[PDB]
Amino acid sequence: PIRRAAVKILVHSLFNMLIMCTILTNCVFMAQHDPPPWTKYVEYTFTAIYTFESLVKILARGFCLHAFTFLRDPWNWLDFSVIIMAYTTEFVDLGNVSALRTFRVLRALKTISVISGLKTIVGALIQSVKKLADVMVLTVFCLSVFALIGLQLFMGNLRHKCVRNFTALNGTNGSVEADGLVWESLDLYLSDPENYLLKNGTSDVLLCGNSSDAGTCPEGYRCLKAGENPDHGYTSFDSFAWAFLALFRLMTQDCWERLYQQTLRSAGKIYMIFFMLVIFLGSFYLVNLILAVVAMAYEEQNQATIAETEECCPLWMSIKQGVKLVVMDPFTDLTITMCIVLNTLFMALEHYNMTSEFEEMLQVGNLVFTGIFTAEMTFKIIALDPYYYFQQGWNIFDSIIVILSLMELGLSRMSNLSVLRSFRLLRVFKLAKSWPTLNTLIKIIGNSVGALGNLTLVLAIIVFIFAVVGMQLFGKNYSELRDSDSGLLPRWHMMDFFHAFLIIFRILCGEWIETMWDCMEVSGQSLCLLVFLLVMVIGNLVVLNLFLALLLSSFSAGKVWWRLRKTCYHIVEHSWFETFIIFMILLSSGALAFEDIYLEERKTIKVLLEYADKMFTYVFVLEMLLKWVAYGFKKYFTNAWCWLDFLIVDVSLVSLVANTLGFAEMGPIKSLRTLRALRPLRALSRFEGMRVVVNALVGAIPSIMNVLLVCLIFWLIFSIMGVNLFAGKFGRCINQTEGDLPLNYTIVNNKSQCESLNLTGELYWTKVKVNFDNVGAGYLALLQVATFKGWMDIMYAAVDSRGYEEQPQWEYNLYMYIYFVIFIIFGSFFTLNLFIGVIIDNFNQQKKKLGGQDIFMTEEQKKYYNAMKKLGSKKPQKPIPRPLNKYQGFIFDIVTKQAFDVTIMFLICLNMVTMMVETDDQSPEKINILAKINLLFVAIFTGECIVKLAALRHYYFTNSWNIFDFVVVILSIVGTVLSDIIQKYFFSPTLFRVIRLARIGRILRLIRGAKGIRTLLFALMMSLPALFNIGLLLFLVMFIYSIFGMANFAYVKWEAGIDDMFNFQTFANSMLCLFQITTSAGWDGLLSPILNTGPPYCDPTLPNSNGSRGDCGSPAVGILFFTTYIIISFLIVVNMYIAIILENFSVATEE
């Protein structure tokens, strides 16, 4: 009949191309927010084509009882759902919320079954998510335990406002409050935002606390616990639903600097030990354990797929011969390859305000280089036939560069897109032939756009699907809700398609929570919670699996003098000598932590460090002099540790001689005695473990220099492009009293209008501090944009662009967002990819050079691993319990059952649930019942404890979990009984808490029985020594930068990032700033006051107690400080990853 004819229609490639064109056109139509009534045509034609497509399918593959074909296929259920949805929506609507249309988008998802083997990529992603399966349950377990720690420590401990003083006024029945105006009731007084403190600069609310460590109220306001909440209401640490969210954003490190720059301000500064626990065990470990299992899963399935796949004539001749002979000269190769270096150095010289004849010489330069390159093209075309010249990797690229640089330049009188200057700028890639590392960065991009080119297309589909789902759902809600006062939407709304795309792009970048707040403020918590977690899990799974795909695809491809020498060698061999030396180095290093801004008033102890310093110098000088003739110059100067000690002793001696003898305080002697912060590095050679760590990092130095040169020469492209696009355009005229807001563009148009109207000295024309003016200044902007910290003020200054030197305007240059999108996709992403891919290979071949293959490992810890691996490998043979008596002999008949063990195991989860239900400011009804059932559970567990003790005499204390069980029992006993002694004591908002935390020791009995948690947690218990060893070096580097910063960065102005409690004024306050920068979190705000100068934003000639004047930090050391601390921290934090993945692979491939 025609069924054989419908099968003939179904198998066309033209039919699949037609369905592709229809799906893509409907994708273009569904991504408009405001459809006009011309959609009577197109929507009916789409639902006609989608009718015709499904009819062709069901005529071939139907009849009635199809459980075998067309409906056991899962991708056709969506196609059937779409057409039945269109047919059930085109008669009559039932609920007119008009959110019905979104399911229509499921049209855009149908193209996964239509294009190619994209149907296999989604199956592989589902295989990897299925493969995780234990990391997820331990993630929710550790987030549960740490959330309960955060409750029993921090309950209600984050609502603290710094309210104004009041009085009960003794004149009414009730609670009248006096603020200089009458106020009714205490409760209504504490609820009005007329009594609170705005922080300086911002518009947050100030937080305080009764503790001695915490933030302090000013001279007239009171620190007490009464208000709404912080951020918008979504950041309190009570109410375990919110504690799980707060510790989850803690785990993915989104804006957590703001979480604990609000926690430590209220709870006291001693609680950064909790954040040092969760950042170094929750975030850095659980995040770096997801990646290991995903990478091992990908490598396993890729290995399986590879394994399964494996199973006229005279003039022409004379002129041609000579030119050809010239062309293959390896010396003429050199004078062009080293000539493009001159061009890219000549274009990286075009700065911000050229001096009107400098620009002419630069144009003449570009013209000369263009002539040199075109002459080369002509000589190589004459050199050999143009069909032979247009062959292979490198001549058509050079032809395209010449014909683009030539044609646009020939359009001499031009409108100018500014791109044309760029057209020449693309030529930097030409030296990838010689350079063996830009070859690999070209291979990564070519591997992403066409050997892994479908997996980026799945990502382009998924980003588009979420940007349409969000635009259809959340789009109308933003409209009148947004504040205006002009007609003015926010920066990160979702009404358009483009803003809807950027807000998904941010969640891919890792910044998701300030959009959840702006979304929950209009759309309710339920939808907005769901969408922005699905985007985060699905999108980061896709982006991460793409990242690992690229990385794997890349790196997959006088005879008493002799006795006098020996007796002096005998004293440095004598162990008490270096035992004295270690304690002397530690004391000499820690003693200079007292150098702070309180050493002027601490006048007494100030001299005690002078004597100490001038004693330590003499001891170390005697040390070097005593080691000299004990070892000889040959053994001493060829050790490369003794050069470090010799350099430090030399610095101390120069400082000493200049200080004592020459009255040498004259000039840069102060800048030389700043350099005595390097004294901790004497310990770097003596603790054997940090010697092992610095050997492992010194060995992998030369690769880092290569990849950093590649990243420098590759960001040079975008820096010259950013100078070409945005030089001078970041110039803002500012009303001074309001501080930090750009002026209206309708009353001040140009800089002429700004500097023309200071009849009063108010208006200041300031640059954004991180501008693109120089090529060197543009590199720091690229560093802030690439590290995902600080880019807001860069993008908002770029998008606001309007001219050359004239006021910015709210969205006058909107589409410049795609420039930073291109930079984050190319620069950050592929840079990081190449960077991790280089380091992994370097550490792998460094392991492939040694003996004992464990790196980051001292010898004694290598002896420890061999005994620690004997503990739990391969399941031990076990003895079986036997009765002894008739009395207790029938008890273990009830106890040793498998039903009793799971009875305890699901009874203790109920004991967890009764811990989860706690709240702040509950009711007195609840504490009584909850405290009664508190003792009830303890009674049950103590009962079964004593039963199992008396049931087995020596067989109790064997399993080493059962010891832990009795320990948790006696901890629960003390935690219940002590509670009654608190009343006759000192202040206890927090002493009872640290006693109450011992009930969480019950929760750690759930891991007895979960093999997916015991295995993967013993993988860290086996990984503690290398983690400890890297940690020493991390603390040491933290210590050295703390002293340099405390020497340099004290007495800066306080603003964006440097408040009264996170500053470089003492050692305790400096450790906290460097701890938040150790995770790269928020270093943008510390640098922003350091880059100041004369007015505004700072003030020189400031009265200063330390004998140093000024209040303005210096940008030269301020940039250097942060920009080398980030890289050093990154490296180490990249070591940690290598140690974790080594111990994971060893346990996994072991059993």
Ligand X SMILES: C=C[C@H]1CN2CC[C@H]1C[C@@H]2[C@@H](O)c1ccnc2ccc(OC)cc12
Evaluated on CA atoms 168, 171, 177, 179, the torsion sign reads negative
Q: Which among ligand X, ligand NAG, none contacts residue 15 (Cβ within 5 to 8 A by kind)?
A: none
Q: Which among ligand NAG, ligand X, none contacts residue 978 (Cβ within 5 to 8 A by kind)?
A: none
> Least CB distance from residue 609 to ligand X, whole Å?
34
H or E segment to which residue 733 belongs = strand 731-734
Residue 540 engages ligand X in binding (rule: CB under 6 A):
no
Q: Which among ligand X, ligand NAG, none contacts residue 788 (Cβ within 5 to 8 A by kind)?
A: ligand X
Q: CA–CA separation, 1037 vs 1031, rounded Å?
A: 10
Q: Which among ligand X, ligand NAG, none contacts residue 113 (Cβ within 5 to 8 A by kind)?
A: none
Please report where in the chains the tokens 């009995």 appear, as a residue: 1005
Among 1055, 1059, 1084, 1143, binds ligand NAG (CB under 6 A): 1059
DSSP state, 559? Answer: T
Stretch that binds ligand NAG, among 316-324, 716-724, 748-756, 1115-1123 (CB under 6 A): 748-756
Q: Per residue in 1087-1097, is it b (16+ CB within 10 Å) or e — as a string? A: bbbbbbeeeeb
Q: CA–CA separation, 957 vs 961, rounded Å?
A: 9
Stretch that binds ligand X, among 598-606, 625-633, 1098-1106, 1129-1137 (CB under 6 A): 1129-1137
Among 13, 173, 356, 885, binds ligand NAG (CB under 6 A): 173
> Least CB distance from residue 734 to ligand NAG, whole Å?
9
Measured from the CB atom, the residue of 219 and 1150 that comes closer to ligand NAG is: 219
Residue 756 engages ligand NAG in binding (rule: CB under 6 A):
no
Q: CA–CA separation, 532 vs 515, rounded Å?
A: 9
Number of residues engaging ligand NAG in binding (CB under 6 A): 36
What's the number of CA atoms in the CB half-sphere (13 Å) around residue 35? Answer: 15
> Least CB distance from residue 763 to ligand NAG, whole Å?
5
Stretch that binds ligand X, among 741-749, 963-971, 1008-1016, 1123-1131 (CB under 6 A): 1123-1131
**Within its chain, how far is the Cα of 671 from the centroid?**
35
Evaluated on CA atoms 722, 723, 728, 730, the torsion sign reads positive
Q: Which of residues 1023-1052 bind ligand X (CB under 6 A)?
A: none
Stretch that binds ligand NAG, among 63-71, 217-225, 397-405, 611-619 (CB under 6 A): 217-225
> Least CB distance from residue 283 to ligand X, whole Å?
6
> Least CB distance from residue 979 to ligand NAG, whole Å?
20
Q: How far is CA 85 from CA 92, 100, 461, 469, 941, in A?
A: 12, 9, 22, 17, 56
Residue 1129 engages ligand X in binding (rule: CB under 6 A):
yes
Q: Which of residues 1074-1093 bind ligand X (CB under 6 A)?
A: 1079-1080
Measured from the CB atom, the residue of 272 and 383 that comes closer to ligand X is: 272
Q: Which of residues 487-546 bind ligand NAG (CB under 6 A)?
A: 488
> Least CB distance from residue 469 to ligand NAG, whole Å?
30
Residue 1130 engages ligand X in binding (rule: CB under 6 A):
yes
> For residue 832, which amino acid is it?
L
Measured from the CB atom, the residue of 650 and 1060 that comes closer to ligand NAG is: 1060
Residue 280 engages ligand X in binding (rule: CB under 6 A):
no
Token digits of residue 404: 């683009």
> Cβ distance 1142 to 1021 under 8 Å?
no
Q: CA–CA separation, 386 vs 202, rounded Å?
A: 66
Among 186, 624, 1133, 1147, binds ligand X (CB under 6 A): 1133
Residue 465 engages ligand X in binding (rule: CB under 6 A):
no
Q: Which among ligand NAG, ligand X, none contacts residue 434 (Cβ within 5 to 8 A by kind)?
A: none
**Rg (Cα) of the chain, in Å, rounded?**
35
Sheet strands (E) in 198-304: 221-224
> Cβ distance 796 to 810 under 8 Å?
no
Q: CA–CA separation, 327 vs 335, rounded Å?
A: 12
> Cβ distance 326 to 379 under 8 Å?
yes
Among 222, 433, 566, 606, binds ligand NAG (CB under 6 A): 222
Residue 287 engages ligand X in binding (rule: CB under 6 A):
yes
Site string for ligand NAG, 689-728 (x = CB under 6 A): ----------------------------------------
Q: Which of 822, 732, 713, 821 is nearest to 771 (CA)?
A: 732
Q: Which among ligand X, ligand NAG, none contacts residue 224 (Cβ within 5 to 8 A by kind)?
A: ligand NAG
Measured from the CB atom, the residue of 294 and 915 that comes closer to ligand X is: 294
Q: CA–CA separation, 139 vs 244, rounded Å?
A: 11
Q: CA–CA separation, 946 vs 959, rounded Å?
A: 16
Q: Which among ligand X, ligand NAG, none contacts residue 810 (Cβ within 5 to 8 A by kind)?
A: ligand NAG
Among 107, 110, 160, 679, binds ligand NAG (CB under 6 A): 160
Token digits of residue 86: 């269109």
In the chain the first and final C-alpha atoms are separated, in Å, by 60
Q: CA–CA separation, 648 vs 658, rounded Å?
A: 16
Q: CA–CA separation, 774 vs 675, rounded Å?
A: 30
Stretch that binds ligand X, among 36-44, 270-278, 447-455, 1127-1135 (CB under 6 A): 1127-1135
Q: CA–CA separation, 714 vs 831, rounded Å?
A: 9
Please report where in the chains the tokens 């005229």 appear, as a residue: 733
Token digits of residue 43: 């929507």
Q: Which among ligand NAG, ligand X, none contacts residue 761 (Cβ within 5 to 8 A by kind)?
A: ligand NAG
Q: Per residue in 426-456, is it b (16+ CB within 10 Å) or e — as a string? A: ebbbbebeeeebbebbebbeebbeeebeebb
Token digits of residue 794: 């860069």
Q: CA–CA separation, 650 vs 868, rounded Å?
A: 45
> Cβ distance 224 to 281 under 8 Å?
no
> Least CB distance from residue 832 to ligand X, whole Å?
7
Report the DSSP pairing between strands 176-178 and 731-734.
unpaired
Task: Say whether the peptide bond before residue 1100 is cis (omega within 30 degrees of 0).
Answer: no
Q: How far is CA 782 from CA 53, 720, 832, in A?
A: 49, 11, 14
Helix, strand, coil % over all residues of the chain, rounded to 5: 65, 0, 30
Token digits of residue 602: 């601490």
Stretch that binds ligand NAG, among 35-43, 731-739, 950-958, 1112-1120 (CB under 6 A): 731-739
Q: Which among ligand NAG, ligand X, none contacts residue 638 (Cβ within 5 to 8 A by kind)?
A: none
Q: Which among ligand NAG, ligand X, none contacts residue 25 (Cβ within 5 to 8 A by kind)?
A: none
Measured from the CB atom, the residue of 799 and 834 that comes closer to ligand NAG is: 799
Q: Any residues with CB less than 8 A from the CB of 907 and at least 6 apart, and which? A: 940
Site string for ligand X, 768-807 (x = CB under 6 A): -------------------xx-------------------
Q: Which among ligand X, ligand NAG, none contacts residue 1079 (Cβ within 5 to 8 A by kind)?
A: ligand X
Measured from the CB atom, the residue of 90 and 762 that comes closer to ligand NAG is: 762
Residue 750 pairs in a beta bridge with 806
> Least CB distance from residue 193 to ligand NAG, whole Å?
18
Residue 758 engages ligand NAG in binding (rule: CB under 6 A):
yes
Token digits of residue 214: 């915490």
Number of residues engaging ligand X in binding (CB under 6 A): 10
Measured from the CB atom, the residue of 612 and 1133 that comes closer to ligand X is: 1133
> Least CB distance from residue 820 to ligand NAG, whole Å?
21
Residues in contact with ligand NAG by the rule CB under 6 A: 160, 165, 170, 173, 200, 209-210, 220, 222-225, 486, 488, 735, 737-738, 744-746, 749-750, 752-755, 758, 761-765, 810, 1054, 1059-1060
Residues in contact with ligand X by the rule CB under 6 A: 283, 287, 787-788, 1079-1080, 1126, 1129-1130, 1133
